[PDB]
Design a binder for these strands. Structure first.
Ligand code: DLU
Ligand code: DLU
Ligand code: MG
Ligand code: MG
Ligand code: MG
Ligand code: MG
Ligand code: ZN
Ligand code: ZN
Lengths: 47, 66, 261, 242, 261, 47, 242, 66
DNA sequence: CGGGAAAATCTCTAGCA
DNA sequence: ACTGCTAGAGATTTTCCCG
DNA sequence: CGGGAAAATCTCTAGCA
DNA sequence: ACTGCTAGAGATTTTCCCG
């Protein structure tokens, strides 16, 4: 599995860790507390 | 018949990018065109490129310039 | 490193020293210190340094609203060519965005529209407009203008041209149409030295011609290729290399260890 | 290069144009153009007709690209010079309009329209448009129930005419035809630009008298001397500008 | 090109076509079209794509005010080392900026301060503070934060650390001092793998030591060099090259065509 | 001589031409209508 | 390498420290440290004293770096634990403070101060500070007329003491001395780190028994065997970690 | 005497930049230090660099590491 | 001299607001 | 006459370590 | 094959707000 | 499951043109 920490939407506070559902080129799809979110890779760190 | 169509399709120029390179490569020769993939020859190197990363044209200026 | 590690984590819990600091202060291998950092939730504060790339298929247009002199300008750009269409609208509403989109779809082959999540672009009216015109709707990740880098950059270029010619028109709508004219036909550059209008004509005509030519080629050239497998469909051959599509997977293989039947 | 004589023979026998000779015999377009222009026995894309129609008490201003059948139309609030000038500036921004054909109406002879034409470099001249108004009205009557307002129905009709209705020899839509015609016009303008660039050069080969320069290739130079085309090596000829 | 030029300028006056557009449309050399563009005042809308470089002399500090949780934080950074000093202040005033500056000058050898044109930094009180402490005052080009790239970047780093440790302190001032501690002594990196505190100590000690050593060397090594000229003062010799200073102009010349007397 | 067109201070409108008084690395000093101004080279074009 | 025997002789004759042997004989600091530690007959920078003084009805909290004479002082609103903890956290952020010496006062034994010391890793222990309070008071009386408020005069006095007053053997200011002392401490810590890193390695050379590793050079390996230092080629020895 | 001082001054490391390069070069050897200029040797190349573009130190870690 | 693993250098980004 | 920078993430290249 | 001049490619920036 | 880009300024490299 992977840990994803991310910045979602105009909120400077980094959140996580979220479960990595999908990694594309440019963006990732994650699940954090049952809330699926789409985050650009500029705004996420996958560990 | 087939050879004329093939050379006609190879007359087209392809501008493209790689997944992690924001710069656009020079005009590569078009070999085959599909719905989601394009097959090109760039400097004696055959590359498959997704349709969303390829700009295909003719360049009328060169087709007139010979 | 059991003693060194434990003293390191205690230091990190208080100060959150980076991996170099703990490695130096506690004689740890870089992997261990980086493990201590990576295992700290509060130290995960930066994403990878990269930029994605937006779709440039011949059918995609990017639409956005911009604002100038208190008015709203709806702007669309053909991503592949940079050809633009703009119009001043009295209000950012789904009705008039849908009308603009209907006009655009009636003038050019619009397959896909890519917009941010402004209420006008997410409106029910625009959804109905796209459905009737057969246009697929794509919405950027919210509050990520980079997903609209093309149209956002065009907003800058359009405003730039409007300022240049703003004094030859009394009204802003006339200046916007003048700027659209100048961009599409009086500015040459890019991948073919074309104007935007010339480039979009070339792109669309080339798409039509290549579709027809490849249709004829596939009608004539019908072969199956065995390499290394199954009867992969033949795509292209020559120059000692063969391009095949095996189970919707296009790959390039050399002429050796491959037979065309 | 090697096919110039074959192209000359083919043109003499069949009166072929330069495009056919260039495509079949692998020749640069300038050489084929010279061949086609060397015989005296062998001797549109920017024209639009603009008119206003009336429907349901509203004014619909229609533009037709004569060569292709492509239509640009929108409901306008009134039949005045200002709206006509705005529409024509829009069209000139979208497509390469060089000349507009109109019916000497009040909105077409206004000073605003003339100023717009002068700004966009459009030439004003005062039966296709009538038949196409009829066709647009037919499509509008077909798709009127799908919209509340007349302008939306008009744009649906424009979309349908340009892209969903196909006909002619090749069974193409209006949009395809206009794209092809504009591409051909672009090709013609590029060829003209290159001909203009090269016609100011003279070549002295083997020295013999000056000759018209046609092509400056990587391995040869194509020239026209005494109404005849000869291929000479680059190192055997000198090219100067006059 | 007299006809071609004139038709080009008439087109440019109306549309402001770029040099490529006029060159293509009017068969002009690139120089002529670029001349038409460059001679148009309204087309001069972009500056050169470059970035300057800020001074990093051992004595320069960059000061700025930042804002966090409704309070004011005065921040100073030693540019050469990245070592920082920060303090929460109740108001952006010249009095307390001058007090902060007096403390800093009393703790470290501050030769020059570089600030933006905020009223606190341009205040008469701060000018008097600098004059008594012998500190040269440098002010950025107004509204050019890039001239303060170092301290502005440090503002980001300091706020970043404050967020990390904000929960171990009740008050913001304590968190700011904790973040200053962490930056100066618990983060290693940069040109020597140093912490900021270690780096500033190295920079200052190295400056003192090099000054003393070069003073002794110049006291001992007193020579005049003739090359190619006048009696240029000798700076360094060896490895087939001689470094000299002729009339306050330091230049490097080979050992050949040069004599040391 | 040189023509300098420049953006001065939070004003998006480009101004000029101004007389070039001094060219450094990173900034230029110009005279425009007897008003000497200091402009970063990022915000000026010298012709 | 070649100078190890000379360094051993010099250390035996003159009881020199490792710095002198390293500087004069071009040896790595670890080898000189081993040489100086090999003889039994041859056998501060982070210490600060903190005190409060009273002046004009205001509390001045003074910090003195014992080794150098460097002074950190500021007027504080009250002699409580909170202000002392804030000042000490400030100092720990500015300079590498490891131990603070105090007078067992109420503000120094407070839980806030102990918590600050625990956070910053400062060790608390309960005549230099008295004399330096006297000197700071003298400078304050010298420069009091130059300021309206006592805090500004105190900071002027701190500046003057640290940078304008010079003395001692070398005639250096307090700031120069503290910078030099901290640089030396940094050197010592780096040497200790490298010694700790290398002391876990054993070398087998020419095979002979394990030997302590001292230096792993580009062209040679320095080892210590049977209380004697020998230089062996890298290809003639194998280094393993135990 | 003089030679010891010279080798001591050359033990120092110099980090520097060129007028149009934002990247910091590797540690060059210090040859001479002035008020406004520093003279360095970087990869057998003697360069004069303004004082405002040079960070000079020792790097205690390497002076201990030998 | 040859690969593999770790170290070092390099490329690129957000935020400073 | 003054001037983008910093430090972390991920990629790619050097160096070194045993054969 | 050798330099010089022009063309082409490359590097980097602000603004989109 | 999605994604920075564009075009102009200045620098540096290729190509070509006559010897
Ligand atoms: C009222 C004073 C006097 C004059 O001007 C204002 C406005 N200002 C604006 C920014 C700012 O825009 N930072 C973002 C940023 C952008 C680019 C970059 F390279 C570095 C950066 F930090 C500041 O940081 C700042 O301190 C001020 C300030 O103090 N003042
Ligand atoms: C209310 C809708 C719905 C949701 O979000 C807001 C806010 N927003 C913000 C920007 C903006 O920040 N542009 C500057 C920029 C920065 C970086 C980059 F790569 C490209 C850029 F254009 C827009 O352009 C924009 O259209 C919107 C918008 O429409 N909306
Ligand atoms: Mg928007
Ligand atoms: Mg936008
Ligand atoms: Mg500020
Ligand atoms: Mg600031
Ligand atoms: Zn942490
Ligand atoms: Zn212009």
């Amino acid at each position: 599995n992977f840990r994803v920490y991310y910045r979602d939407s105009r909120d400077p506070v980094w959140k996580g860790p979220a479960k990595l559902l999908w990694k594309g080129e440019g963006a990732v799809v994650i699940q954090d507390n049952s809330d699926i979110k789409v985050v650009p890779r500029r705004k996420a760190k996958i560990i | 018949e087939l050879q004329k169509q093939i050379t006609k399709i190879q007359n087209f120029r392809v501008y493209y990018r790689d997944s992690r390179d924001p710069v656009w490569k020079g005009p590569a020769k078009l070999l085959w065109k599909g719905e989601g993939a394009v097959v090109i020859q760039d400097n004696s190197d055959i590359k498959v490129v997704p349709r969303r990363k390829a700009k295909i044209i003719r360049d009328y200026g060169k087709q007139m310039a010979g | 490193f059991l003693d060194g590690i434990d003293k390191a984590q205690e230091e990190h819990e208080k100060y959150h020293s980076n991996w170099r600091a703990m490695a130096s202060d506690f004689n740890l291998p870089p992997v261990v210190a980086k493990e201590i950092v990576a295992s700290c939730d509060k130290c995960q504060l930066k994403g990878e340094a990269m930029h994605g790339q937006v779709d440039c298929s011949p059918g995609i247009w990017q639409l956005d609203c911009t604002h100038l002199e208190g008015k709203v300008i709806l702007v669309a750009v053909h991503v592949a060519s940079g050809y633009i269409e703009a119009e001043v609208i009295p209000a950012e509403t789904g009705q008039e965005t849908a009308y603009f989109l209907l006009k655009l779809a009636g003038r050019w082959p619009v397959k896909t529209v890519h917009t941010d999540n402004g209420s006008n672009f997410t409106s029910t009216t625009v959804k109905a407009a796209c459905w009737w015109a057969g246009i697929k709707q794509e919405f950027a990740i919210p509050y990520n203008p980079q997903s609209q880098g093309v149209i956002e950059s065009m907003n800058k270029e359009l405003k730039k041209i409007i300022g240049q010619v703003r004094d030859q028109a009394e009204h802003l709508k006339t200046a916007v149409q003048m700027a659209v004219f100048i961009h599409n036909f009086k500015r040459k550059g890019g991948i073919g030295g074309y104007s935007a209008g010339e480039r979009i004509v070339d792109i669309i005509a080339t798409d039509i011609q290549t579709k027809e030519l490849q249709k004829q080629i596939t009608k004539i050239q019908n072969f199956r290729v065995y390499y290394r497998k199954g009867p992969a469909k033949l795509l292209w051959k020559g120059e000692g290399a063969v391009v095949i599509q095996d189970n919707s997977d296009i790959k390039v293989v050399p002429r050796r260890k491959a037979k065309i039947i």
